[PDB]
Amino acid sequence: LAASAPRRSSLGFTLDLHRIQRDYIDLVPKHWHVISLSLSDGGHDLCITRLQAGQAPFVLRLPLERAVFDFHTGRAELLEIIKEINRTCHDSRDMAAKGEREKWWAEREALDQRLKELLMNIEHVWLGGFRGVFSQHGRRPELLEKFRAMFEGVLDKHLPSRKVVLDGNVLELFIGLGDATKSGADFDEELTDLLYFVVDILQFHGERNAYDEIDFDSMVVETMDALMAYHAEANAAPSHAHTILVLDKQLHVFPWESLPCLQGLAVSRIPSLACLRKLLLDRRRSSSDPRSAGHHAPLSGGTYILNPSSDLLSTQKTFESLFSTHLHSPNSWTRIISRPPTEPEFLSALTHSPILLYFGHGSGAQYIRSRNIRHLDHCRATVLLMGCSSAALTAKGEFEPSGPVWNYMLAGAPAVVGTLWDVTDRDIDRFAGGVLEGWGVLPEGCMGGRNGLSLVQAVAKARDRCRFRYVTAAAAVVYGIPVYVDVDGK
């Protein structure tokens, strides 16, 4: 029976995992996968669990220091960067008054590069050759069985062996490294990382092999050629994949979606499997197909709240006419502009509108008490909180059960888009316009026919529109499940 880890498989744990698979994961659309990230009690290991309907669960425990840049150090650098980013947002008006807009811009460019580098280093050091656990590639058993035969050959040739069989999930890590036939592709370090893993799994399960007696570099070359064979065949004969992250309390502050290996891919977060299951069982079908897996929100009857505190003039200017022309006039949207929404107005929008667009400061919590979002029979609205730190993490970067996002999720909002830290009006508006175009709320070309990406796909693509991919766009995240706009729906 196939080994997947360098440690004892505990029967109670495996039973629990199989019960979770049966009662939660087997309801999840098969083209979606669920990945949990947490730290070991020690803090030394990143624990990754990958779950998908019709697939065996995969549990990974990655020691961050297996090769200084430990978790404490990475998180500290992230929080310092965020603090400096937030400060550039608050000092915008001030710097402009001092005639120093250029130095201000340069500071933001420098922070953008610093955050990019941190994410590069996380992917390189922490994930290393395991980054493929995040791969959205379609599984192809026939191709995998070929790769298995070639890879088992590599082991026979270079190990002694001169017995333990690997789970397919371990082999999928190799496949998940990416297209090996790409010009300039170099997986040597990654492959080394995974070959150590395989030797360790073997060692633990009774097939011992000394590191110094293995020619890893020869194993790397042959494995890469095997992956080139795999990907050559996969590319020759060519999904709506979505990833859903479940994150431990201290890991929401990390912009996972902006790691090199997740950039541009459709990724959302969910607070718990319980929240996931609730949202799935509440899904609305399209008025009229992998898209049938999502929640379908009618375009008609939304609410927008634009510049509620009146000081976001640039934002009002950017969207007011577009929203009038495309939403309020033909699609029966409720318009609240340059005045605060009342709490009853806000609640009524959550209850009755399929889509709520909030273009104001923060999460809007200044306008609606948390406890009344919990009294709601149902939060019908998919909610876009296009504002500074609208996810409302604590000063220490923690995601709390009392925060707005948890409250919306518990109330049943199909999705909530928000920001992990402070962002400028101009640059988050670029992102927001991108979301609305890609999602199909606005026509293509508005911001410069009609697209129909899921909200999650639209968020991932709209990151491209920001001047700063990291200082701005990486703040943006979506909690919930894929939502599609139903243009003719009611």
């Binding site: 744990f13 995992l17 309390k249 059960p401």
Partner: peptide, 11 residues
């Protein structure tokens, strides 16, 4: 259900 607790946070 210790490494699985991350899946069952909150209420």
């Amino acid at each position: 259900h210790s490494q699985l607790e991350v899946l069952f946070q909150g209420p």
